[PDB]
């Protein structure tokens, strides 16, 4: 049952700090170094340092010396990584990782990951706009329609179709960061065109950080 | 200190066929006093942490099937999947542990190669609801195509646009190995009711000439 269970996602503003925990089980926490590794979008894995769960000692590479503090708490088998002076380059998924193989500093145990967003933007709910099955049936004898979820912060947003009933054909695109600091995405679905008069298509948009719950009906 | 460079960045291989990923170290991971190469490989499937795949260059971590193989020496290494399965689609990383700081490569994405399929193209004019906000979004949809490489051009009144559009690609679908792309053109409203015709023009390898979709108003 060996596993490392990390804390939930974090959103922060430049200058602030962030602290992520990692809880070990299924092995001797005080037997192995506990490392931290991050992954920024289009960057590649990056080692941040380790903490000795027995002595409480640490070691950080130059890049993170002065910004990172690693600590443990053996009473509850839990490690902590703390990062200060956050910038946009600190946006990444933060992993705790353990290596158990002698003389091999490579990690066979990883936490599920903790995404950390760093931005000056503030919590904003999205506007939901229909992408109605356009003026003419001819979309192939099949039809395409969707919902445009625009100008929200932060990630994630949740889009389903008819309360989760319609999943086949639906493509929920990855959000894209606009120049306003706000994310935006579209969700589309391919449908039989005969049923545009028969079926009612509703998309269920859910943005928890702002408690936005919108159901947009998409009619021709 | 030690940089790690993988090649290629992206790789498409047919089911059943052979996948080869290289990794170059800037220094040399071979220790002459034990004849060991200090190099590891990882497999990272979407939305999950890395999984240790191979260490000491060619030793398979416990649980790794036989079709995964590591080879090479000193500054030049290679991960090989001999008979590519569907569950092997992922990002593969090489990591050196000769020197600290322990450094990784940039990753190599491995995806299923299939027969070329041109996209179905769809176009959506802005909703009216979006009329009042003062912003107009025109969305072009490229549906179920392979490979991922495509080019979407926008033309309002046959004027090519540049700077007012963004793109979003899905990950390769698990039932048909296709991709889907959305291209959104963003105009203030103080510009959408001026030009009759809006067009996205799609370039793809499965099309010997562009496909165009348009509407008026």
């Amino acid at each position: 049952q060996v596993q490392l269970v990390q804390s939930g996602a974090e959103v922060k503003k430049p200058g602030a700090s962030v602290k992520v925990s990692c809880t070990a089980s299924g092995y001797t926490f005080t037997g192995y170094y506990l490392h931290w590794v991050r992954q920024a979008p289009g960057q590649g894995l990056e080692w941040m340092g380790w903490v000795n769960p027995r002595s409480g000692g640490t070691s950080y590479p130059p890049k993170f010396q002065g910004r990172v503090t690693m600590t443990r708490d053996t009473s509850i088998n839990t490690a902590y990584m703390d990062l200060t002076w956050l910038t946009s380059d600190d946006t990444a998924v933060y992993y705790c990782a353990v290596g158990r193989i002698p003389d091999v500093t490579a990690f066979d145990i990883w936490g599920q990951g903790t995404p950390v967003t760093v931005s000056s933007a503030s919590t904003k709910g999205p506007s939901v706009f229909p992408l109605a099955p356009s003026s003419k049936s001819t979309s192939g004898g099949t039809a395409a329609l969707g919902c445009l979820v625009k100008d929200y912060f932060p990630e994630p947003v949740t889009v389903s179709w008819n309360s989760g009933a319609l999943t086949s054909g639906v493509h929920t695109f990855p959000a894209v960061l606009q120049s306003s600091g706000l994310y935006s995405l579209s969700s589309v679905v391919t449908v039989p065109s005969s049923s545009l008069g028969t079926q009612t298509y509703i998309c269920n948009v859910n943005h928890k950080p702002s408690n936005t719950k919108v159901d947009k009906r998409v009619g021709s | 200190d030690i940089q790690m460079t993988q090649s290629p960045d992206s790789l498409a291989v047919s089911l059943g066929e052979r996948a080869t990923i290289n990794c170059k170290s800037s220094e040399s991971l071979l220790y002459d006093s034990n004849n060991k190469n200090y190099l590891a490989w990882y497999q990272q499937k979407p939305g999950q942490p890395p999984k240790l795949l191979i260490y000491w260059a060619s030793t398979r971590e416990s649980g790794v099937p036989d079709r995964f193989s590591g080879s090479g020496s000193e500054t030049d290494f290679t991960l090989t999947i001999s008979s590519l399965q569907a569950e092997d689609v992922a990002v593969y990383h090489c990591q050196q542990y000769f020197s600290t700081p322990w450094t990784f490569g940039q990753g190599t994405k491995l995806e299923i190669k299939r027969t070329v399929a041109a996209p179905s193209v769809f176009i959506f004019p802005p909703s009216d609801e979006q009329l009042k906000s003062g912003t107009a979004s025109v969305v072009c949809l490229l549906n179920n195509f392979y490979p991922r490489e495509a080019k979407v051009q926008w033309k309002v009144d046959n004027a090519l646009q540049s700077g007012n559009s963004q793109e979003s690609v899905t990950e390769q679908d698990s039932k048909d190995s296709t991709y889907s792309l959305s291209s959104t053109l963003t105009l203030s409203k103080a510009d959408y009711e001026k030009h009759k015709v809006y067009a996205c023009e799609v370039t793809h390898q499965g099309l010997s000439s562009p496909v165009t979709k348009s509407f008026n108003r």
């Binding site: 192995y32 170094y33 769960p53 158990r100 002698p102 500093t105 | 220790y31 000769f98 020197s99 600290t100």
Partner: peptide
């Protein structure tokens, strides 16, 4: 020569 390993204490 390699840096000391950091896998088991």
């Amino acid at each position: 020569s390699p840096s000391s390993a950091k896998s088991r204490l």
